[PDB]
Structure to design on (96 residues):
């Protein structure tokens, strides 16, 4: 995500938050992480992938 | 990679983080705020 710093640092922020939260809050953080991974993949998709 | 997919993902992302407001301990409050602000910036970037 070197060409999309905002997205990269959001991913990092969420991973860090995941390690500090619990229960249902952690599920919501993991939901956010999954959304970011989906958005990252489509922003970085090369032809042939 | 459609625009519909993109918007749905950004909406789900916003809603998930919004649920954390008032629900995390004090020491995590600012981090939730930061992530919410990043998501809104990411959304505006794509409109």
């Amino acid at each position: 995500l070197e060409k999309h710093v905002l997205l990269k640092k959001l991913r990092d922020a969420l991973e860090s938050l995941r390690g500090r939260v619990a229960g249902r809050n952690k599920d919501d953080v993991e939901e956010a992480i999954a959304m970011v991974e989906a958005l990252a993949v489509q922003l970085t998709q090369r032809e042939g992938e």
Notes: The radius of gyration of chain B is 12 Å. Helices of chain B lie at 3-20, 26-45. DSSP finds two helices and no strands in chain B. Chain B touches chain A through 24 residues (CB under 8 Å).
